[PDB]
Design a protein around this motif. Structure first.
Motif, PDB file in Angstrom:
ATOM      1  N   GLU B   1       0.806  -1.220   0.000  1.00 50.32           N
ATOM      2  CA  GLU B   1       0.000   0.000   0.000  1.00 50.32           C
ATOM      3  C   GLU B   1       0.826   1.250   0.000  1.00 50.32           C
ATOM      4  O   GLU B   1       1.410   1.585   1.007  1.00 50.32           O
ATOM      5  N   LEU B   3       0.606   4.473   0.611  1.00 52.63           N
ATOM      6  CA  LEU B   3      -0.134   5.524   1.245  1.00 52.63           C
ATOM      7  C   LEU B   3       0.762   6.658   1.689  1.00 52.63           C
ATOM      8  O   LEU B   3       1.877   6.446   2.096  1.00 52.63           O
ATOM      9  N   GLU B   4       0.251   7.868   1.634  1.00 53.16           N
ATOM     10  CA  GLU B   4       0.983   8.986   2.168  1.00 53.16           C
ATOM     11  C   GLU B   4       0.832   9.098   3.656  1.00 53.16           C
ATOM     12  O   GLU B   4      -0.198   8.847   4.175  1.00 53.16           O
ATOM     13  N   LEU B   5       1.891   9.472   4.333  1.00 49.93           N
ATOM     14  CA  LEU B   5       1.852   9.639   5.753  1.00 49.93           C
ATOM     15  C   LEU B   5       1.245  10.971   6.140  1.00 49.93           C
ATOM     16  O   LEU B   5       1.372  11.944   5.456  1.00 49.93           O
ATOM     17  N   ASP B   6       0.601  10.982   7.283  1.00 46.77           N
ATOM     18  CA  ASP B   6       0.011  12.150   7.842  1.00 46.77           C
ATOM     19  C   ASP B   6       1.045  13.194   8.188  1.00 46.77           C
ATOM     20  O   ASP B   6       2.175  12.906   8.385  1.00 46.77           O
ATOM     21  N   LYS B   7       0.611  14.424   8.272  1.00 42.96           N
ATOM     22  CA  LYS B   7       1.441  15.527   8.640  1.00 42.96           C
ATOM     23  C   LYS B   7       2.351  15.228   9.819  1.00 42.96           C
ATOM     24  O   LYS B   7       3.486  15.593   9.813  1.00 42.96           O
ATOM     25  N   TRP B   8       1.825  14.557  10.819  1.00 41.92           N
ATOM     26  CA  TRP B   8       2.476  14.398  12.083  1.00 41.92           C
ATOM     27  C   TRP B   8       2.977  12.988  12.321  1.00 41.92           C
ATOM     28  O   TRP B   8       3.494  12.700  13.334  1.00 41.92           O
ATOM     29  N   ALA B   9       2.833  12.129  11.345  1.00 40.72           N
ATOM     30  CA  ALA B   9       3.215  10.735  11.427  1.00 40.72           C
ATOM     31  C   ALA B   9       4.655  10.470  11.827  1.00 40.72           C
ATOM     32  O   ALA B   9       4.970   9.430  12.326  1.00 40.72           O
ATOM     33  N   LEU B  11       6.471  12.612  13.843  1.00 40.38           N
ATOM     34  CA  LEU B  11       6.777  13.292  15.057  1.00 40.38           C
ATOM     35  C   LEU B  11       6.635  12.329  16.208  1.00 40.38           C
ATOM     36  O   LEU B  11       5.784  11.495  16.195  1.00 40.38           O
ATOM     37  N   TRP B  12       7.476  12.577  17.267  1.00 39.71           N
ATOM     38  CA  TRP B  12       7.415  11.635  18.375  1.00 39.71           C
ATOM     39  C   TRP B  12       6.170  11.802  19.106  1.00 39.71           C
ATOM     40  O   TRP B  12       5.784  12.881  19.371  1.00 39.71           O
TER      41      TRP B  12
END
Lengths: 213, 12, 236
Positions: B1, B3-9, B11-12
């Protein structure tokens, strides 16, 4: 990505402890939220980041999991908790919601009463024919309604509508409406509604022969 | 898949 | 303290452009990492994610609806707009706007992802219907009680309220005097683009001979009122 919620529906009583599950087709780390939605209102956030309790949310709600398996837990069900619940993942775009989990007021199984209504002479004069099948006061909500016209299974020309769970007896009712043209209606004899439901030992058929008088 | 990662994916 | 509110037209015709506005308070789109998203809910169905815009003008769209969607913001007006071109009847839904938190920051430093992983406050929702039809009052037909509609000492009967637009329609029985056993079903949108519903009631079969039953139907958008008397079936 697919988010799968289970069960789709569940019966429960006040004071009960319930558990709703959400699985992701691939890992979404902890990026998972749960919401409660009451009929006619927007969703309300219960849990964010998989396990974090949203400020102002009663302590009975909790969440667990990471990666692909997540669960929401209501320790002691309150009246306000009969509602539908959704999960949402926010680890990948597009963000995605699960399909929802309906939670209703449990009661004893009750088979529906089935009634079939031929189209009125009044409607017929107008050129169309609606055949209505009614499933009254049943529980639980799941029902299967099948239309047959002279043994011909009808697919795609009927529509169903279901009431909200009754506030008194905790039952549902359902209508299934078969629509035909007048001409088509008058080409056939037997109109039959077949109902499958948990409370019925076997499928119930309610039918009539048109014009029989 | 893919899929694009979320804006904050990330970040810790 | 955070509030959001959707505005727009309740009715749009197919092929046309829908513009929805989210108006908010209690936060600013100048807040670092803040998002405003859009989610919809077709009648009877589940939530569907549409789009999101951030403080930095970063935006993302649903892949399935992405050629038809544009998202914009005016940070000084506290508004976000969603444009959806070429609407069609599948687009009939309740549309919500919603706030997404930015990450935890310490004196401006982002120190924690957590809080971003939800949509924490939602607007109330705006119902939008996509249809090419015009106002039309319903026809009321009888659902006649009969042997095929009898169970012990109980019979069912009703009224079929057919081909109206738009919502809503109200129904009572016997001018309000009959309320018990009554089920008025939610309307369905037919493929014709017109609504239809039916209202039913269960009564004692013994009473069919003497008691009169009438459904009172009000469709305010078309100024149509109908009282339909419902009689036992003749060919039973």
């Amino acid at each position: 990505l697919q988010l799968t919620q289970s069960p789709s529906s569940l019966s429960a009583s006040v004071g009960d402890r319930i558990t709703i599950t959400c699985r992701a087709s691939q890992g979404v780390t902890s990026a998972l939220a749960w919401y409660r939605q009451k009929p006619g209102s927007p969703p309300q956030l219960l849990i964010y980041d998989a396990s974090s309790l949203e400020s102002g949310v009663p302590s009975r709600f909790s969440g667990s999991g990471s990666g692909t398996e997540f669960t929401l837990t209501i320790s002691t069900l309150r009246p306000e908790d009969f509602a539908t619940y959704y999960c949402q993942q926010l680890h990948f775009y597009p963000h995605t919601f699960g399909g929802g989990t309906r939670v209703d007021v449990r009661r004893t199984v009750a088979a529906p009463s089935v009634f079939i209504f031929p189209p009125s002479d009044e409607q017929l004069k107008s050129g169309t024919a609606s055949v209505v099948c009614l499933l009254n006061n049943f529980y639980p909500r799941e029902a299967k309604v099948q239309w047959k016209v002279d043994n011909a299974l009808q697919s795609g020309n009927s529509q169903e509508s279901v009431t909200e769970q009754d506030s008194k007896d905790s039952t549902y009712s359902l209508s299934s409406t078969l629509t035909l043209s007048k001409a088509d209606y008058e080409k056939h004899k037997v109109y039959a509604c077949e109902v499958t439901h948990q409370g019925l030992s076997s499928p119930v058929t309610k039918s009539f022969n048109r014009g029989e008088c | 898949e893919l899929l694009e990662l979320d804006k904050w994916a990330s970040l810790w | 303290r955070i509030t959001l509110k959707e505005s727009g037209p309740p009715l749009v015709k197919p092929t046309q452009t829908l513009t929805l506005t989210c108006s908010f308070s209690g936060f600013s789109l100048s807040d670092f990492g803040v998002g405003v998203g859009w989610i919809r809910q077709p009648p009877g169905k589940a939530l569907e994610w549409l789009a999101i815009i951030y403080s930095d003008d970063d935006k993302r769209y649903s892949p399935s609806l992405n050629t038809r969607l544009t998202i914009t913001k005016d940070t000084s007006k506290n508004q976000v707009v969603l444009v959806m071109t070429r609407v069609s009847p599948v687009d009939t839904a309740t549309y919500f706007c919603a706030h997404r938190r930015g990450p935890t920051t310490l004196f401006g430093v982002p120190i924690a992802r957590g809080p971003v992983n939800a949509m924490d406050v939602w607007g109330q929702g705006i119902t939008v219907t996509i249809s090419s039809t015009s106002t039309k009052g319903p026809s009321v037909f009888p659902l006649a009680p009969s042997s095929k509609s009898t169970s012990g000492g109980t019979a069912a009967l009703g009224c079929l309220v057919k081909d109206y637009f738009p919502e809503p329609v109200t129904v009572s029985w016997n001018s309000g005097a009959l309320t018990s056993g009554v089920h008025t079903f939610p309307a369905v949108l037919q493929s014709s683009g017109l609504y239809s519903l039916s209202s039913v009631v269960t009564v004692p079969s013994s009473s069919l001979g003497t008691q009169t039953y009438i459904c009172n139907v009000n469709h305010k958008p078309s100024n149509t009122k109908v009282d339909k008397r419902v009689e036992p079936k003749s060919c039973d």
